[PDB]
Design a protein around this motif. Structure first.
Motif, PDB file in Angstrom:
ATOM      1  N   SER A 288       0.829  -1.220   0.000  1.00  0.00           N
ATOM      2  CA  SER A 288       0.000   0.000   0.000  1.00  0.00           C
ATOM      3  C   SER A 288       0.853   1.256   0.000  1.00  0.00           C
ATOM      4  N   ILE A 289       0.370   2.294  -0.689  1.00  0.00           N
ATOM      5  CA  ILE A 289       0.936   3.667  -0.632  1.00  0.00           C
ATOM      6  C   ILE A 289       0.025   4.533   0.228  1.00  0.00           C
ATOM      7  N   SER A 290       0.553   5.153   1.274  1.00  0.00           N
ATOM      8  CA  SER A 290      -0.298   5.937   2.201  1.00  0.00           C
ATOM      9  C   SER A 290      -0.804   7.191   1.478  1.00  0.00           C
ATOM     10  N   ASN A 291      -1.950   7.691   1.910  1.00  0.00           N
ATOM     11  CA  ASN A 291      -2.522   8.933   1.364  1.00  0.00           C
ATOM     12  C   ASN A 291      -1.531  10.101   1.537  1.00  0.00           C
ATOM     13  N   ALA A 292      -0.771  10.152   2.627  1.00  0.00           N
ATOM     14  CA  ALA A 292       0.229  11.221   2.875  1.00  0.00           C
ATOM     15  C   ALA A 292       1.289  11.197   1.761  1.00  0.00           C
ATOM     16  N   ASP A 293       1.619  10.032   1.190  1.00  0.00           N
ATOM     17  CA  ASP A 293       2.591   9.974   0.057  1.00  0.00           C
ATOM     18  C   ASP A 293       1.898  10.306  -1.265  1.00  0.00           C
ATOM     19  N   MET A 294       0.643   9.894  -1.445  1.00  0.00           N
ATOM     20  CA  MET A 294      -0.066  10.028  -2.739  1.00  0.00           C
ATOM     21  C   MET A 294      -0.456  11.494  -3.000  1.00  0.00           C
ATOM     22  N   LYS A 331       8.892   4.848   0.887  1.00  0.00           N
ATOM     23  CA  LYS A 331       8.601   5.284   2.285  1.00  0.00           C
ATOM     24  C   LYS A 331       7.630   4.338   3.007  1.00  0.00           C
ATOM     25  N   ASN A 332       6.867   3.517   2.268  1.00  0.00           N
ATOM     26  CA  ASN A 332       5.827   2.599   2.792  1.00  0.00           C
ATOM     27  C   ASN A 332       6.380   1.217   3.096  1.00  0.00           C
ATOM     28  N   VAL A 333       7.644   0.931   2.744  1.00  0.00           N
ATOM     29  CA  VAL A 333       8.251  -0.415   2.965  1.00  0.00           C
ATOM     30  C   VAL A 333       9.681  -0.277   3.498  1.00  0.00           C
ATOM     31  N   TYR A 334      10.164  -1.286   4.202  1.00  0.00           N
ATOM     32  CA  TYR A 334      11.609  -1.468   4.403  1.00  0.00           C
ATOM     33  C   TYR A 334      12.117  -2.217   3.190  1.00  0.00           C
ATOM     34  N   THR A 335      13.236  -1.798   2.630  1.00  0.00           N
ATOM     35  CA  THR A 335      13.705  -2.315   1.324  1.00  0.00           C
ATOM     36  C   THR A 335      15.089  -2.906   1.494  1.00  0.00           C
ATOM     37  N   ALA A 336      15.250  -4.097   0.963  1.00  0.00           N
ATOM     38  CA  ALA A 336      16.527  -4.824   0.917  1.00  0.00           C
ATOM     39  C   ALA A 336      17.003  -4.846  -0.520  1.00  0.00           C
TER      40      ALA A 336
END
Ligand SMILES: O=C1C[C@H](O)[C@H](Cc2ccccc2)NC(=O)CCCCCCCCCCCCCNC(=O)[C@H](Cc2cccnc2)N1
Ligand SMILES: *[C@@H]1O[C@H](CO)[C@@H](O[C@@H]2O[C@H](CO)[C@@H](O)[C@H](O)[C@H]2NC(C)=O)[C@H](O)[C@H]1NC(C)=O
Ligand SMILES: [Cl-]
Ligand code: NA
Length: 350
Positions: A288-294, A331-336
């Motif tokens: 999901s992408i949060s509304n604050a990012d969209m 910003k919505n995930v931890y990324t490896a």
């Protein structure tokens, strides 16, 4: 070993920067940490551009270990270009050193490429797209067996939607070199494998996208059945083909393309009081992408309409990517970012 780069969040999630140290003795710079390119560069102290006068620059003359070349450095990015010459020097970041790192010493850019507090960029993607032809700093470390685990963990902190946020937030997130930070994620990492032909950008296929409940056609003439997506810490928003952007915004009631005469062609706006539910499906899971990012807020005097984080940009048919998935998503995930076996992983944030 492992080492940590503390991130500064510049421009309300525009860019995420970390400290690099160059030369003997060390000259320190704040540089964009960019998973969408593969070159290190810094503005040179001889640069006469206005931005160079107002930020920290690399003085080649005061580094006893600097090796000059006449070799041109010329890089093009989505946001414009940087030019100068290659040099070689000792470079340190996150407690590691590469004693003979080739990098750009930049003395001109296109307008507004970077500014204070930034001095340049550190590419975190693969050697095959390095304009310099030099092995990237991170890739030398991974290849040399200096890391406990052959991966970088990325947490980008969110200030968009914080009405009291600054243009410079020194508490901006973290990159862990040589592992993942188990305090910043919850549950298992979902790794999407990258085959040996795809080691250029950091990129993975998009499986599906759902906006306002509707699965969007992500087919494109450029990318066929499924687009290859750059997972790009150095891009602010999410860039998709024009036909795809039209299809995305067709799912939001009241959405429209901003006109060419607005100055915002490629952007789309929709009713501000519509909270958009949207996810991207990677490796069999919806993120999901949060509304604050969209929701980027109103770009025009029409305060009832807000710009979305997906923007239209047709890519050269020479490009192996059709999407650029930037910070708005990340910003919505931890990324490896995993060197071997090559993969991008996502985990829920803690
Ligand atoms: O730009 C990027 C994306 C990168 O994260 C920049 C970073 C940046 C941000 C603020 C300042 C400077 C560098 N990001 C951006 O430029 C932010 C805006 C991106 C807009 C969406 C991307 C569209 C790019 C496609 C056309 C550009 C030509 C190819 N250029 C590219 O693909 C280059 C790498 C590269 C590949 C091959 C040869 N040389 C360099 N990467
Ligand atoms: C993983 O993330 C945590 C949380 O951000 C880091 O914890 C901070 O570490 C410093 C010193 O190492 C402490 O003084 C802070 O109080 C910690 N902050 C919080 C909120 O816990 C941790 O250092 C990171 N680990 C690695 C290896 O990078
Ligand atoms: Cl969804
Ligand atoms: Na494809």
């Amino acid at each position: 070993a492992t080492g940590t780069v503390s991130l500064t969040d510049v421009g309300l999630d525009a860019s995420y920067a970390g400290q690099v140290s160059i030369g003997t003795p060390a000259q320190d710079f704040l540089v964009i940490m960019d998973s969408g390119s593969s070159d290190l560069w810094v503005a040179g102290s001889t640069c006469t551009e206005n931005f160079c006068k107002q930020t920290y620059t690399f003085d080649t003359s005061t580094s006893s270990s600097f090796i000059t070349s006449s070799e041109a450095f010329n890089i093009t990015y989505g946001s414009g270009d940087a030019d100068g010459t290659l040099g070689t020097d000792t470079v340190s970041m996150a407690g590691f050193t590469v004693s003979d790192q080739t990098f750009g010493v930049v003395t001109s850019t296109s307008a507004n490429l970077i500014s204070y507090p930034l001095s340049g960029l550190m590419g975190l993607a693969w050697k095959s797209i390095a304009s310099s032809g030099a092995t990237p700093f991170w890739q030398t470390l991974a290849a040399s067996g200096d890391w406990d685990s052959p991966e970088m963990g990325v947490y980008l902190k969110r200030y968009r939607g914080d009405n009291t946020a600054s243009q410079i937030e020194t508490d901006g997130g973290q990159i862990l070199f040589g592992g993942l930070n188990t305090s910043l994620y919850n549950g298992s990492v979902n790794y999407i494998s990258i085959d040996e032909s795809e080691k250029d950008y950091w990129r993975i296929p998009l499986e599906a996208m759902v906006i306002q409940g509707n699965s969007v056609s992500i087919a494109s003439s450029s990318g066929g059945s499924n687009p290859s997506c750059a997972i790009d810490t150095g891009t602010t928003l999410i860039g998709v083909p024009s036909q795809t952007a039209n299809r995305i915004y067709s799912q939001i009631a009241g959405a429209e393309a901003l006109s060419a005469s607005s100055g915002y062609e490629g952007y789309y706006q929709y009713p501000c009081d519509t909270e958009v539910t949207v996810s991207l499906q990677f490796g069999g899971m919806s993120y999901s992408i949060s509304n604050a990012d969209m929701n980027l807020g109103s770009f025009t005097r029409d305060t009832s309409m807000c710009t979305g984080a997906f923007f239209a940009m047709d890519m050269s048919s020479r490009s192996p990517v059709q999407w650029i998935v930037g910070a708005s998503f990340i910003k919505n995930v931890y990324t490896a970012f995993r060197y071997n076996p090559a993969a991008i992983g996502f985990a829920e944030l803690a």
